[PDB]
Design a protein around this nucleic acid. Sequence first.
RNA 1: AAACGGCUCUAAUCUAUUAG
DNA 2: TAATAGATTAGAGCCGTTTA
Lengths: 295, 131, 412, 56
Amino acid sequence: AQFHDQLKARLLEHTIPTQILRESTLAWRDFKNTFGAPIRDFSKIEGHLAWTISTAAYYKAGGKPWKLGPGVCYLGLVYKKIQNACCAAQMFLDNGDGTVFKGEVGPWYNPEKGEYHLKPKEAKALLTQALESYKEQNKSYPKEVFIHARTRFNDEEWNAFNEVTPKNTNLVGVTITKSKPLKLYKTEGAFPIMRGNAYIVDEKKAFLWTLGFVPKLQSTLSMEVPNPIFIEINKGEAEIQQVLKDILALTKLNYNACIYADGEPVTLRFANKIGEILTASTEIKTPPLAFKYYI
Amino acid sequence: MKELIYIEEPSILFAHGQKCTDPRDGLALFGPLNQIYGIKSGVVGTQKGLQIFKSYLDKIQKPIYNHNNITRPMFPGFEAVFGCKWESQNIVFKEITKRTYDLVTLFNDKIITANKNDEERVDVWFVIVPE
Amino acid sequence: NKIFISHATPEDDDFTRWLSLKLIGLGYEVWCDILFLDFWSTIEKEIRENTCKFLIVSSTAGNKREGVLKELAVATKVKKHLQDDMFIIPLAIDENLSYDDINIEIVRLNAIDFKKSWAKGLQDLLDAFEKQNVPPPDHSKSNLLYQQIFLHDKQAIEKEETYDSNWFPIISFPNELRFHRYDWRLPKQFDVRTLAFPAIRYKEYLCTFAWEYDFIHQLPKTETYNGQESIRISTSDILSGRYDTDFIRNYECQRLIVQLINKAFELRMKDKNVREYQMSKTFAYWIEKGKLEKDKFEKIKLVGKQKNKYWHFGISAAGKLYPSPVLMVSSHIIFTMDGINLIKSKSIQHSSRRKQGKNWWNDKWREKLLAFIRFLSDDQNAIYLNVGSEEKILISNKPLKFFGKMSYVTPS
Amino acid sequence: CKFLIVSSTAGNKREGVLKELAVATKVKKHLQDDMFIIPLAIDENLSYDDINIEIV
RNA sequence: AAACGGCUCUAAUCUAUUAG
DNA sequence: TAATAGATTAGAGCCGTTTA
Ligand SMILES: [Mg+2]
């Protein structure tokens, strides 16, 4: 089970960008089921397979495939069960207009079994690390810090966040929950709801279809009926429409895949991946912090 | 009859400042932002794994087709899209021939010895894991 | 100063589109039929009047079609006219077609190899008619051309669309929620979930919307109990959050109401002639085979057959009150061998569900969910929940409806 | 059975003869015989170049 | 572990209450 | 400590490749 994560972790100390490919992936036809068609039928997606592998290989070799289109540091943070470990992934725009998307590492440990929240010290450490990274990349503190996670934030950890952020900087806490049961269909067409539609419930909570039918691709990013992601602004002050726009933008930077877009903001997904990598093996002091060593 | 708002599709930048929504179509049309000159591919795995990776890297050069080319675009070919060379004849090979720990250790120490001792540079190591 | 590209349109559409878009990117005026949304006279005018190069794509289907052959013929006539040997540049792209079996009219020309690494072929084309003096690069033109014709056929349009959801609103609640002071009439070790009406053990009280004398058949000590001991709480204040007292908080009271809704709907399916199967967190309710006319409700199939197994559409209900009083039914597929007996193994059920949902899409899912909910309904536009002898929970048959100002043209 | 098209300077680009030739090639494709349409070139000024694609 | 999804399964925690 | 819910959360597998 844990070959990929352990292998990627043990190479973190001596930073070596690596890509794991299975023989059943590169040459899927050779491996049948002893009865017929191969285990991994990639015939319909062979071009897509080549696309994705090529994109991954170009990214891990120091290539920047596509950018995004300021002053906002998007901090997607995710907890992993082990004690729980919080691992972040930051993305922001510099004065050079080149999106910086590396991921904040050095996971912060909450010893409580089921508390998917940070203690004040760990929260201060995480926010200081993110703010200092933004300052060193941009020569100034961020105008907004868009902290988002798959969990809600308690008052004490958000109070630590607010105590540790400097002045004239506003931070907004966003919870993106998947598989919330709102299967919203289309009574007219035979195809699912077009991607990008958002059901704004209140000023702080809403549903978003980051995935679904796209006119440009003339089909769906997802089988069946799309599952909307629930965006709740449980902490901070921000417009719900702006938050939805930002989440849709973050759904674009999946450099691990060559797909039009993914159902979740990519900061959360990449933070999850580096969290698996970190928690796979022993502790690493100042881990590499660049995605090509994790994804 | 609750209002469903629309959020405009964000455009991801590409080479020459050309913005397109689809990463695949934008990559094929214009290309990546920065021009790495090539991939010094390094491969750790079995000889059969090396053969499989080399055959697939040969196939990558020629354009390949999806079954439905409009729902999911074609791959023009690695040099056609990215503008950098990734041939299969320029591969640094590392032959191989609690179980999880030692199985990871095999590929791991192969990679570390190759990155440490070997003179030939590798930009990214393609671990061809058997099945 | 145009670069004419001739090809077999359906077979070589992708290659021609890529090459033409690139060439327009580098700053070369390019003419192709797939780049334009009679026509043949325009083709002749462009070929004879102001084209510099004539590229012909040479796949195995680009040499046996009449149209490509005759544009190549007019091209060679113009080639002999200009007295320029550099007019017709073949572009062989197919591995199956060798440098033999190729048309006489194009057999003698020096082709450019696109068989491998289209980038090398494009580089050969570029350094070919760069020193061949064929007449600034502006990739924005290529992006625009990609958007106008390759993209405009399908895009986001200002079209109104209407949507059915998973959310079925709760039309009406029982007005008063009743806590019963059941010290000794209710055994402490008795399970309140098997009571004939939904019941929670809250603060030693018996949370229910039901009257104090419903729990008689299986709880006979509860008779002769004073109704003043019961605390009756306005459900409207619970929903609006007005009721927040030291006795009971608003959120926990709403949690009790949601537990009541879920349990009552569970017993409703218990009496609704619908079978149940155990999921991880909830129960899935599906119709057995043969319990519907031609395996259909109205005109929507809810039970069918695939590869010696049978599938039953199933629903799993759970209420919530945050946006409004409304439950969210969930759509599942439950598999069986003979349609009446369940498959015990869960992995085979999962594989069968992933097989069956492969061909199901928005229309099928929505029609099956709506058919199921209208099937369980007693009232024409509502479903009854027996939470009290005189009190009931009304669930709207029509789920919450939505509408959007932007949509797409449905391809079919 | 056969379709002889006059191929003079005026008779190879006029609209009516062009449409008749177009439907002629359509029925030729339907009949699957290459021995259908016959151009009769009569005009000294009109060379074998500059002639219509559909008959070239 | 090319990948993204749809599901299926399991566990934990926080609340409120009841029995230890 | 055990239980009964509802709400949040997290982990695993597992199948299909997005109706032309
Ligand atoms: Mg990957």
